[PDB]
Scaffold this active site. Structure first.
Site, PDB file in Angstrom:
ATOM      1  N   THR D   1       0.962  -1.237  -0.206  1.00  0.00           N
ATOM      2  CA  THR D   1      -0.026   0.463   0.270  1.00  0.00           C
ATOM      3  C   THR D   1       0.010   1.575   0.033  1.00  0.00           C
ATOM      4  O   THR D   1       1.977   1.621   0.310  1.00  0.00           O
ATOM      5  CB  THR D   1      -1.166  -0.379   0.905  1.00  0.00           C
ATOM      6  OG1 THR D   1      -1.972  -1.142   1.091  1.00  0.00           O
ATOM      7  CG2 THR D   1      -1.714   1.826   1.511  1.00  0.00           C
ATOM      8  N   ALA D  49      -5.524  -6.883   5.351  1.00  0.00           N
ATOM      9  CA  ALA D  49      -6.311  -5.988   4.636  1.00  0.00           C
ATOM     10  C   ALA D  49      -7.423  -6.213   5.539  1.00  0.00           C
ATOM     11  O   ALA D  49      -8.275  -5.917   5.466  1.00  0.00           O
ATOM     12  CB  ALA D  49      -6.127  -6.578   3.134  1.00  0.00           C
TER      13      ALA D  49
HETATM   14  C1  LIG Z   1       0.190  -3.003  -0.108  1.00  0.00           C
HETATM   15  C2  LIG Z   1      -0.714  -2.635  -0.974  1.00  0.00           C
HETATM   16  C3  LIG Z   1       0.637  -3.871   0.262  1.00  0.00           C
HETATM   17  O1  LIG Z   1       1.766  -3.009   1.382  1.00  0.00           O
HETATM   18  C4  LIG Z   1      -0.954  -2.069   1.298  1.00  0.00           C
HETATM   19  O2  LIG Z   1      -0.646  -2.558   2.520  1.00  0.00           O
HETATM   20  C5  LIG Z   1      -2.655  -3.703   1.729  1.00  0.00           C
HETATM   21  C6  LIG Z   1      -3.364  -3.144   2.308  1.00  0.00           C
HETATM   22  C7  LIG Z   1      -4.657  -2.856   1.404  1.00  0.00           C
HETATM   23  C8  LIG Z   1      -5.033  -4.704   0.929  1.00  0.00           C
HETATM   24  C9  LIG Z   1      -5.678  -2.468   2.356  1.00  0.00           C
HETATM   25  N1  LIG Z   1      -2.104  -4.487   1.842  1.00  0.00           N
HETATM   26  C10 LIG Z   1      -1.660  -6.052   1.035  1.00  0.00           C
HETATM   27  O3  LIG Z   1      -2.650  -5.781  -0.329  1.00  0.00           O
HETATM   28  C11 LIG Z   1      -1.712  -7.025   2.112  1.00  0.00           C
HETATM   29  C12 LIG Z   1      -0.482  -6.838   2.966  1.00  0.00           C
HETATM   30  C13 LIG Z   1      -0.216  -8.169   3.687  1.00  0.00           C
HETATM   31  C14 LIG Z   1      -0.142  -9.607   3.196  1.00  0.00           C
HETATM   32  C15 LIG Z   1       0.149 -10.305   4.335  1.00  0.00           C
HETATM   33  C16 LIG Z   1      -0.449  -9.641   5.999  1.00  0.00           C
HETATM   34  C17 LIG Z   1       0.077  -8.441   5.900  1.00  0.00           C
HETATM   35  C18 LIG Z   1       0.063  -7.765   4.552  1.00  0.00           C
HETATM   36  N2  LIG Z   1      -2.733  -8.059   1.554  1.00  0.00           N
HETATM   37  C19 LIG Z   1      -3.330  -9.030   2.239  1.00  0.00           C
HETATM   38  O4  LIG Z   1      -3.986  -8.723   3.376  1.00  0.00           O
HETATM   39  C20 LIG Z   1      -3.708 -10.350   1.232  1.00  0.00           C
HETATM   40  C21 LIG Z   1      -5.229  -9.749   0.346  1.00  0.00           C
HETATM   41  C22 LIG Z   1      -5.741 -10.494  -0.212  1.00  0.00           C
HETATM   42  C23 LIG Z   1      -4.430 -11.881  -1.161  1.00  0.00           C
HETATM   43  C24 LIG Z   1      -7.439 -10.256  -1.205  1.00  0.00           C
HETATM   44  N3  LIG Z   1      -4.305 -10.952   2.302  1.00  0.00           N
HETATM   45  C25 LIG Z   1      -3.819 -12.357   2.397  1.00  0.00           C
HETATM   46  O5  LIG Z   1      -2.397 -12.356   2.166  1.00  0.00           O
HETATM   47  C26 LIG Z   1      -3.966 -13.572   3.184  1.00  0.00           C
HETATM   48  C27 LIG Z   1      -3.975 -13.214   4.593  1.00  0.00           C
HETATM   49  C28 LIG Z   1      -2.715 -13.559   4.639  1.00  0.00           C
HETATM   50  C29 LIG Z   1      -2.795 -13.802   6.565  1.00  0.00           C
HETATM   51  C30 LIG Z   1      -2.690 -12.521   7.973  1.00  0.00           C
HETATM   52  C31 LIG Z   1      -3.063 -12.974   8.525  1.00  0.00           C
HETATM   53  C32 LIG Z   1      -3.038 -14.212   9.372  1.00  0.00           C
HETATM   54  C33 LIG Z   1      -3.314 -14.925   8.540  1.00  0.00           C
HETATM   55  C34 LIG Z   1      -3.665 -15.208   7.004  1.00  0.00           C
HETATM   56  N4  LIG Z   1      -3.511 -14.410   2.641  1.00  0.00           N
HETATM   57  C35 LIG Z   1      -3.787 -15.165   1.817  1.00  0.00           C
HETATM   58  O6  LIG Z   1      -4.742 -15.362   0.991  1.00  0.00           O
HETATM   59  C36 LIG Z   1      -2.206 -16.898   1.235  1.00  0.00           C
HETATM   60  N5  LIG Z   1      -2.982 -16.922  -0.534  1.00  0.00           N
HETATM   61  C37 LIG Z   1      -2.311 -15.868  -1.263  1.00  0.00           C
HETATM   62  C38 LIG Z   1      -2.488 -16.379  -1.840  1.00  0.00           C
HETATM   63  O7  LIG Z   1      -2.766 -17.605  -2.676  1.00  0.00           O
HETATM   64  C39 LIG Z   1      -2.703 -18.551  -1.466  1.00  0.00           C
HETATM   65  C40 LIG Z   1      -2.679 -17.731  -0.454  1.00  0.00           C
END
Ligand SMILES: *[C@@](C)(CO)[C@](*)(O)[C@H](CC(C)C)NC(=O)[C@H](Cc1ccccc1)NC(=O)[C@H](CC(C)C)NC(=O)[C@H](CCc1ccccc1)NC(=O)CN1CCOCC1
Lengths: 244, 222, 240, 212, 195, 233, 235, 231
Positions: D1, D49
């Site tokens: 982000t 997210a």
């Molecule tokens: C920028 C874009 C990146 O830092 C921003 O900070 C954004 C904030 C927005 C989305 C509000 N952050 C993210 O995009 C964030 C980065 C991140 C990921 C994981 C942990 C911390 C920060 N992304 C997510 O949260 C993604 C969003 C999904 C893909 C729409 N979610 C995941 O990665 C999930 C949840 C992870 C998780 C966190 C805590 C506990 C358990 C799990 N994980 C997956 O979907 C796993 N994976 C995805 C790929 O396919 C196989 C499974």
């Protein structure tokens, strides 16, 4: 079930009084009289033992006067066993404050907390209240010498001179007559004994039927001393004021 | 040391039209290099014109679908048989997933149906509950293969109008149910070719105002 | 734990324990609250059957809940301490989470809620206390005066009294207080409060306590001589 | 982000990207990273997210309950402190949240609070939060003045996100603009970087590092 | 959080606290006040783990303010410091301890003397003529050993404090964006706006 | 957190036109030591279901007790306990599947792989799998452990899809199962020659066969094999 | 004494029946439902003239689409409202939608019988719950301490209830406008009230789909009182 | 007299008066009827109103797709017990993938009501229930009383003036039991049965309440214009 046998100790009368508190006060009115008098340079605590027997060990005895810490003491009127429960709590509360703030507990704070405990027994828990009234005599560096009293209701008030237990009505009139504000300790000692001597239900007031204590600044330079009088010391002070 | 998670493979795909919505998924179930079942459905009718799939660890997937189906049942009891709207279902699912934030359901969840204006709707969820409505979403093992193809063919990304010097974009339009199924079938045959965990069979669930129809197609079994 | 339902309904639809708690308030020493144009004044009675008292250390009738709010009461003294303590804690808790001191309405609502909870909780009796809560909201110059009672109901008052012989002093205030024109100054407000207490008290010596609260945490208690001047002035005007 | 918000003469500007990633996999280009809590309060989302989306939605319910109970809209300070006290209870449990609570009230005026998942809460005029925060800071700081016009402030916020969207691999998609005044928040559109980059390059003459 | 200093002189206690708040490779704020007023004549500065610092400081502040209202009386700096130490001494054996270090500068109105207490996150209390937490001490202690005198004025103390900040700005690796200075004396607490 | 001590190997099964067949050897291994030889790993529930269990044997015996107790509990206040309200295979499976997933969710699993084979009241064949993770699936052929790698390939040559089930007789189906058990004896280091087999038919009911042996083995070609490359003797 | 959750020989709970007597002593509250909206009105009843009447809060908001009026031991209603508000907001959090008026009422009524030897006694207050939703439209409910609730086209509770209810029986029809309903509440309140009705001792409120739940100002109600007096003199 | 203070006390003749007083609350309640054939089971309920301005109190509650009941007495107590049945029906589905038997449903209600009659502090339930359902052994009808006693029947009725409908069903037993594969005729018989308990009032469109369950019919409730067919 058990509802049948419940006395309901914490309820109001139609007149808005607490039955059990009122009856506990009636109990206290039969207990041996205890007087507190506050002077400019110290405090006196005098109390009458309940009908003594000649074979009672007098010197190694404690019934009326108890030490809470180095700067605070209490005179008891009512059930002794009930008072000792509350005294150990008060002693602990004083040590908690010292441990927390590294300063001796202010007198009022100790009194309030002990009085708050009594209040709790009148509002909740379904238990009988403590059948005890205290006279607190103590010193701190904020208000100096202080006299308080608390009763089973958990209400406390401050005094210049006060009596609890038996014949308080007669005792309070005599104190109100002879007390004045610029009074010394030695004078207050004499007033305390003279008052008991006239309000006593006994034939004559003797050393073996009394407990006595002073809280002076009579130690060396700016420090407070607690004197719990020995039997022989009461015998001497009784002769010195011309009662025996 | 005991490991409470596993990977059951497979892949799923959701597309939304003007007055309809589809939710497809292959029927293969696997662990490591073995096939467990060639036909084990993982797209489910949950009532109120809501179809759902939770792909990944099948035990967690089944548990979640089971709980949501139950959530729908109790929604009817507590609110006078009211129809659970797709947007309400999504928010409810978020709370199911986030409820296990510190011991997650290892699944990618997708639901599909119609919104309250009658228009096609697809929602997608991460394992811990973050969700988003979209026209288009692929999930699971072959999501990385299928998703960019969908961007190109459903949302017309990177496509410009011929002769306009790359200035005018290809205009967005809804796709017919016939055209959407073509894209689904081509997506899964392609994914079957290049991903080992994808194959055996394809099961599509279509959702219109009339109800929930099914279609099945064979896939390569190697 | 002690579970007994002490506060319960009777055939005629009354909760006697709550009503008997009101009798305890009726027994208590009188307390009065009057709010002016730019201030509020809290007056309190002290019974004179107690001589040889030490007024330095004896608990005062008016209590500060925060630097901008005060609380006076009528009824059981021991009960009042428990409400005051809970109120003082809630006052600091509000500053900690909301980053702003309590409004007088909020503080009243909290205290009233505590009083109500004791009317339908097992093992406890109602508080034998009614309170007058007065002060000024943060960054506000409009005076606030509220009343609570054992049942738990609360409301705002232009002026109000509680305790023994309160129905006499309420009668006095009802004709002497004008809504269209409240006491314009501090002196006018204190005088009306002292006047109202003089209908009931006895002597104006060490029997009346007065506490004045002004905006922006400006609270002060009057001494004997200052109060005695109001008593001397009122009596001379009376002989007419 | 990448997210930012700054205070100025004409209120508050708030700008965010719309990308969501799972490692190097670009998962979404159309994520709404600004929550409209009420007509006078906004919240930005960076980090996990689900954590952000769940708790800032929960946050809006608590603030609704405040105005029901107190018959008054919640202050920005109190709003931000509810969030910071919440995440502090979960400190060490692994929440990942970088948020900014932006809004206007009568007593406070325009106010911005930075709140993150390790319990930090800071009032301030300018903040940039996210993996591309440094890229946004570079453009924003070097062009910031208090006396910017509403038109110029909106553009600077938009341009700062674009700068980060370009350089930061984990930022992009599109820019969402908001303007907060005494009358409340106003939405100023969704701007796809696909078209916005070239439009800005041509008109501004910037981005000379890129092959035109 | 990083630099907090304290100097007790003849008639006052002077606290200096850095303004920077950093997280990662970004200075998020350069005007942060790392202190809370516990009572009219008692001030506490703090430094340590993010979040823990402010949460702890305000929790102490609330407790001391509650005491002040209850007793209508101000606790002595010695009493406040002992309360703070005990809270930290509890904390260290908790599930998740407060990782906060504090300095408590106060003026005792009964003794008419200024007092400076240094307490670390373990609950280690010491009264000092001059104190510091973190890496600051490694420069300032030896400096103050040389230049400090017990009978100095408040103005002499501020010059002595400038001498510390200059040394830190010269030899410290991180940019801490200057300091906010506050004085505690018989007339209460006030902030020096131009430092 | 567990580690399995005394263990049981493959369980294999398949569907045929009128019912289902299931089999499992009678060995209880203690690591590499082939400790216990009289272990029955097929457990019938009523006259219409057979539960085959692999993995930890202490946990198997616990599951035995649960099933035994389930029959008792079902009979309570149930006049139709031997008729309409008798325990179905689908009921027995779902119960176990619930337990297995609850135990994994408490990080204290029943270290097993289970196959519930039986026939429903309406005649339909029932065959479904569940393991320590709570994972469930169904297929015309199902097998655990080495059986999954070696038996399934052989059994799928007989019944490759749904439409092949009516075309498969009980004679053909049992032959394939017995063959698979021989292959597992050749190639699984923790298997034994002795095994049990169970058939549940919609017409003839439950047939439980004990003390079977692998036979008609090919070992004669071994005598011709000499050295590992260049030895001639 | 005797148990709190005891049945009488007639088959009623003593404490519940006694709480109903407490509600009869309470101040009057009236509600009328129309196709254009639902109106709620109450008698304030100040115990003394010095009491600032605007601080008497007997009409209360639960959500934007649900309002509430009370009668009886009003202090008991605080925790009931608190619960209702939480239930309403919580349902919006879990389901991203407004909660049905009937579902809200049912949640409140579940508290009612949670007493015994849970709280020590039943509630001594009745509630009129008015609101709107997309499914069943404009609705008015009466929630008692028995745990029972009835939907009403119109309903009066409090000291003058039986007299007011008989009047509502004659006056209510299915084609009532909102303005007609407002006047009708004022008319019936003035009939059963002890003191003379004015803007200071009586309060009006309504809930409409468009503008949601609104408590009327003392200026707005005063004009409706003046409009009411003129119309009665006109024939 | 002296033995009716609580439920924990027996009278000298061995009676539980609090349980009997709870039974009295049912007699005050509005009439409801239950009957069944071999293919279907029907509930008919007369709803009651406060006045003409009020709604009519809903008497019938759904428990599962194959089970539900009608109530008579304290409505909140019916909500508590119906909720318990919903959970027990649901536990049977999630854990055993099995529709809960109507007989077990009765056994569970009995044991829940009993515990409230043997302990100090609590009170008996103040409501009677008629449970209908279709399970693996065909159609069923149960009668629940808060004493704990549950009874399986062909037909019955509870509430005020229920004796009229109960007599009619006792006469009509041989007729209505054989109404198989005909829902409307089984309802007609139930509507004619409840009509034997009416006094001064008749069955109107917003007064009557009918529910049915059967072989190829999920548990559904009919109110409003959907019952105009049967008047
Ligand atoms: C920028 C874009 C990146 O830092 C921003 O900070 C954004 C904030 C927005 C989305 C509000 N952050 C993210 O995009 C964030 C980065 C991140 C990921 C994981 C942990 C911390 C920060 N992304 C997510 O949260 C993604 C969003 C999904 C893909 C729409 N979610 C995941 O990665 C999930 C949840 C992870 C998780 C966190 C805590 C506990 C358990 C799990 N994980 C997956 O979907 C796993 N994976 C995805 C790929 O396919 C196989 C499974």
């Amino acid at each position: 079930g058990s509802r049948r046998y419940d006395s309901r100790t914490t309820i109001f009368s139609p007149e808005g009084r607490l039955y059990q508190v009122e009856y506990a006060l009636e109990s206290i009115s039969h207990a041996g009289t205890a007087i507190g008098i506050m002077a400019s340079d110290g405090i006196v605590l005098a109390a009458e033992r309940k009908v003594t027997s000649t074979l009672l060990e007098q010197d190694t005895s404690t019934e009326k006067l108890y030490k809470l810490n180095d700067k605070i003491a209490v005179a008891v009127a009512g059930l002794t066993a009930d008072a000792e429960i509350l005294i150990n709590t008060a002693r602990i509360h004083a040590q908690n404050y010292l441990k927390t703030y590294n300063e001796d507990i202010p007198v009022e704070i100790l009194v309030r907390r002990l009085s708050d405990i009594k209040q709790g027994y009148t509002q909740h828990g379904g238990l009988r209240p403590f059948g005890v009234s205290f006279i607190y005599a103590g010193y701190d560096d904020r208000y100096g010498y202080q006299l308080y009293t608390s009763n089973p209701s958990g209400n406390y008030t401050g005094w210049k001179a006060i009596s609890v237990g038996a014949n308080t009505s007669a005792a309070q009139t005599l104190l109100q007559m002879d007390y004045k504000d610029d009074m010394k300790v030695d004078d207050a000692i004499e007033l305390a004994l003279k008052t008991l001597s006239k309000t006593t239900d006994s034939s004559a007031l003797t050393y073996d039927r009394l407990e006595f204590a002073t809280i002076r600044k009579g130690a060396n330079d700016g420090e407070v001393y607690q004197k719990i009088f020995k039997p022989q010391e009461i015998k001497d002070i009784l002769v010195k004021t011309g009662i025996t | 040391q005991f490991n409470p998670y596993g990977d059951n493979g497979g892949t799923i795909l959701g597309i939304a039209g003007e007055d309809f919505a589809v939710l497809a998924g292959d029927t293969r179930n696997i662990t490591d290099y073995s096939i467990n079942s060639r036909y084990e459905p993982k797209v489910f009718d949950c009532g109120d014109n809501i179809v759902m799939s939770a792909n990944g660890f099948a035990a967690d997937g089944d548990a979640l679908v089971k709980r949501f189906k139950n959530s729908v049942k109790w929604y009817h009891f507590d609110h006078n048989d009211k129809k659970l709207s797709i947007n309400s279902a999504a928010r409810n699912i978020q709370h199911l997933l986030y409820g296990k934030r510190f011991f997650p359901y290892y699944v990618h969840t997708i639901i599909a149906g119609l919104d309250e204006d009658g228009k096609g709707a697809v929602y997608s969820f991460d394992p811990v509950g973050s969700y988003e409505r979209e026209q288009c979403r692929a999930g699971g093992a072959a999501a990385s293969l299928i998703m960019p193809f969908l961007d190109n063919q459903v949302n017309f990304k990177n496509q410009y109008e011929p002769g306009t010097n790359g200035k005018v974009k290809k205009p967005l339009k809804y796709l017919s149910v016939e055209e959407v199924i073509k894209l689904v079938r081509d997506s899964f045959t392609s994914a079957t070719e290049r991903h080992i965990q994808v194959g055996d069979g394809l099961e599509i669930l279509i959702v219109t105002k009339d109800g929930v129809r099914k279609e099945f197609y064979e896939l390569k079994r190697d | 734990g002690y579970d007994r339902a002490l506060s319960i309904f009777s055939p005629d639809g009354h909760i006697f324990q709550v009503e008997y708690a009101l009798e305890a308030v009726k027994r208590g020493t009188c307390a009065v609250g009057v709010k002016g144009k730019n201030c509020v004044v809290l007056g309190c009675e002290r019974r004179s059957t107690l001589k040889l008292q030490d007024t330095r250390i004896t608990p005062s009738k008016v209590s500060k809940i925060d630097s901008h709010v005060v609380l006076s009461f009528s009824g059981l003294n021991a009960d009042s301490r428990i409400l005051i303590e809970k109120a003082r804690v809630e006052a600091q808790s509000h500053r900690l989470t909301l980053e702003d001191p309590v409004t007088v309405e909020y503080l009243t609502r909290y205290v009233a809620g505590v009083q109500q909870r004791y009317t339908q909780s097992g093992g406890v009796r109602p508080f034998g206390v009614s309170t007058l809560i007065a002060g000024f909201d943060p960054r506000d110059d409009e005076p606030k005066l509220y009343q609570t009672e054992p049942s738990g109901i609360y409301s705002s008052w232009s002026a109000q009294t509680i305790g023994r012989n309160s129905k006499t002093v309420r009668e006095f205030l009802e004709k002497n207080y004008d809504r269209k024109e409240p006491p314009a100054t501090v002196e006018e407000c204190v005088k009306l409060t002292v006047r109202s207490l003089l209908e009931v008290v006895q002597t104006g010596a060490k029997n009346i306590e007065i506490t004045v609260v002004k905006p922006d945490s400006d609270i002060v208690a009057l001494s004997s001589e200052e109060i005695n001047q109001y008593v001397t002035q009122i009596e001379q005007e009376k002989q007419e | 982000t990448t997210t930012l918000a700054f205070r100025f003469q004409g209120g508050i500007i708030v700008a965010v990207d719309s990308r969501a990633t799972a490692g190097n996999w670009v998962a979404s280009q159309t994520v709404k990273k600004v929550i409209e809590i009420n007509p006078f309060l906004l919240g930005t989302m960076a980090g996990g997210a689900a954590d952000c989306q769940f708790w800032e939605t929960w946050l809006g319910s608590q603030f609704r309950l405040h105005e029901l109970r107190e018959k008054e809209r919640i202050s920005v300070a109190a709003a931000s402190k509810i969030l910071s006290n919440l995440v502090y209870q979960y400190k060490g449990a692994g929440l990942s949240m970088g948020t900014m609570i932006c809004g206007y009230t009568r007593k406070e005026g325009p106010t911005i609070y930075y709140v993150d998942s390790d319990g930090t809460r800071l009032k301030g005029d300018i903040f940039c939060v996210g993996s591309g925060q440094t890229f946004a800071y570079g453009v924003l700081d070097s062009n910031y003045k208090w006396d910017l016009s509403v038109e110029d402030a909106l553009y600077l916020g938009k341009r700062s996100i674009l700068a980060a969207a370009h350089r930061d691999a984990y930022s992009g998609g599109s820019v969402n603009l908001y303007h907060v005044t005494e009358d409340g928040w106003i939405y100023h559109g969704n701007h796809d970087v696909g078209e916005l980059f070239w439009k800005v390059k041509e008109e501004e003459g910037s981005f000379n590092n890129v092959i035109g | 959080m990083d630099i907090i200093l304290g100097i007790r002189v003849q008639d006052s206690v002077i606290l200096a606290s850095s303004k920077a708040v950093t997280r990662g490779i970004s200075v998020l704020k350069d005007s942060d006040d790392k202190t809370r007023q516990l009572s009219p004549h008692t001030l506490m500065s703090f430094a340590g783990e993010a979040g823990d610092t402010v949460q702890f400081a305000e929790y102490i502040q609330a407790n001391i303010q509650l005491y002040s209202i209850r007793e209508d009386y101000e606790l002595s700096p010695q009493a406040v410091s002992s309360f703070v130490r005990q809270e930290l001494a509890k904390s260290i054996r908790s599930r998740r301890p407060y990782q906060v270090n504090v300095l408590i500068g106060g003026y005792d109105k009964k003794k008419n003397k200024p007092e400076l207490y240094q307490i670390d996150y373990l609950g280690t209390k010491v009264e000092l003529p001059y104190g510091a937490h973190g890496y600051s001490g490694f420069y300032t202690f030896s400096l103050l050993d040389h230049h400090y005198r017990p009978d100095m004025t408040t103005e002499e103390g501020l010059d002595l404090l400038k001498l510390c900040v200059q040394e830190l700005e010269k030899r410290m690796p991180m940019d801490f964006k200057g300091v906010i200075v506050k004085i505690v004396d018989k007339d209460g607490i006030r902030q020096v706006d131009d430092f | 957190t567990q580690q399995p001590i005394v263990t049981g190997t493959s369980v294999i099964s398949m569907k045929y036109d009128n019912g289902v067949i299931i089999a499992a050897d009678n060995l209880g291994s203690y690591g590499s030591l082939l400790r216990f030889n009289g272990v029955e790993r097929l457990i019938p529930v009523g006259d219409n279901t057979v539960v085959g269990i692999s993995g930890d044997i202490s946990d198997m015996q616990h599951i035995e007790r649960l099933l035994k107790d389930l029959v008792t509990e079902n009979a309570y206040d149930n006049p139709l306990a031997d008729a309409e309200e008798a325990l179905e295979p689908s009921y027995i499976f779902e119960y176990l599947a619930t337990v297995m997933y609850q135990r994994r969710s408490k990080m204290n699993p029943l270290w097993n792989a289970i196959i519930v084979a039986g026939v429903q009241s309406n005649g339909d064949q029932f065959l479904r799998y569940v393991n320590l993770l709570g994972v469930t699936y169904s297929s015309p052929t199902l097998a655990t452990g080495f059986g999954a790698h070696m038996a399934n390939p052989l059994l799928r040559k007989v019944v490759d899809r749904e439409s092949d089930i009516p075309k498969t007789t009980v004679q053909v189906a049992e032959e394939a199962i017995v063959n698979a058990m021989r292959v597992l004896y050749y190639r699984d280091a923790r298997s034994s020659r002795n095994f049990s087999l169970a058939i549940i038919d919609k017409n003839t009911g439950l047939t439980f066969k004990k003390n079977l042996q692998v036979e008609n083995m090919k070992w004669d070609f071994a005598k011709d094999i000499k050295g590992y490359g260049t030895q001639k003797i | 004494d005797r148990g709190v959750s005891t049945f009488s020989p007639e088959g009623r709970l003593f404490q519940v029946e006694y709480s109903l007597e407490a509600i009869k002593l309470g101040s009057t509250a009236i509600g009328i439902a129309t196709k254009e909206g639902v109106v709620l009105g109450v008698e304030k009843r100040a115990t003394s003239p010095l009491l600032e009447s605007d601080s008497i809060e007997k009409i209360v908001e639960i959500d934007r689409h649900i309002g509430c009026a009370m009668s009886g031991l009003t202090a008991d209603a605080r925790s009931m409202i608190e619960h209702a508000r939480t239930a309403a907001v919580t349902h919006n959090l879990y389901y991203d939608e407004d909660i049905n008026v009937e579902s809200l009422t049912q949640s409140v009524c579940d508290l009612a019988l949670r007493f015994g030897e849970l709280m020590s006694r039943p509630f001594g207050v009745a509630l009129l719950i008015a609101g709107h939703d997309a499914d069943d439209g404009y609705q008015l409910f009466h929630a008692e301490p028995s745990g029972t609730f009835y939907r009403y086209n119109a309903k009066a509770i409090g000291s003058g209830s039986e007299g007011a209810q008989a009047e509502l029986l004659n006056e209510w029809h299915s084609s009532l406008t909102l303005k007609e309903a407002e006047l009708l509440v004022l008319k019936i309140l003035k009939q059963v009230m002890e003191e003379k009705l004015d803007e200071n001792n009586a309060q009006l409120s309504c809930i409409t789909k468009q503008d949601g739940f609104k408590i009327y100002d003392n200026e707005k109600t005063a004009e409706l009182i003046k409009e009411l007096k003129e119309k009665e003199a006109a024939e | 007299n002296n033995y009716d203070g609580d439920t924990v006390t027996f009278s000298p003749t061995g009676r539980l008066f609090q349980v009997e007083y709870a039974l009295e609350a049912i007699k005050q309640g509005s009439v409801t009827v239950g009957l069944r054939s071999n293919t279907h089971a029907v509930l008919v309920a007369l709803k009651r109103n406060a006045d003409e301005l009020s709604s009519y109190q809903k008497k019938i509650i759904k428990c599962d797709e194959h089970m539900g009941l009608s109530l008579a007495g304290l409505a909140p107590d019916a909500r508590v017990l119906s909720n318990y049945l919903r959970q027990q029906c649901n536990y049977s589905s999630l854990v055993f993938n099995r529709k809960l038997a109507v007989e077990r449903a009765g056994h569970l209600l009995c044991d829940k009501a009993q515990k409230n009659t043997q302990s100090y502090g609590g009170r008996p339930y103040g409501v009677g229930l008629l449970i209908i359902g279709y399970d693996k052994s065909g159609a069923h009808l149960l009668e629940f009383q808060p004493s704990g006693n549950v009874t399986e029947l062909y037909g019955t009725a509870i509430g005020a003036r229920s004796q009229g409908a109960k007599t009619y069903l006792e006469r009509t037993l041989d007729t209505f039991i054989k109404i198989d594969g005909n829902p409307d005729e089984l309802i007609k018989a139930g509507v004619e049965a409840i009509s034997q308990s009416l006094r001064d009032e008749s069955l109107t469109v917003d007064n009557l309440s009918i529910a049915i369950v059967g072989k190829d019919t999920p548990f559904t409730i009919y109110d409003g214009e959907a019952v105009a067919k049967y008047i």
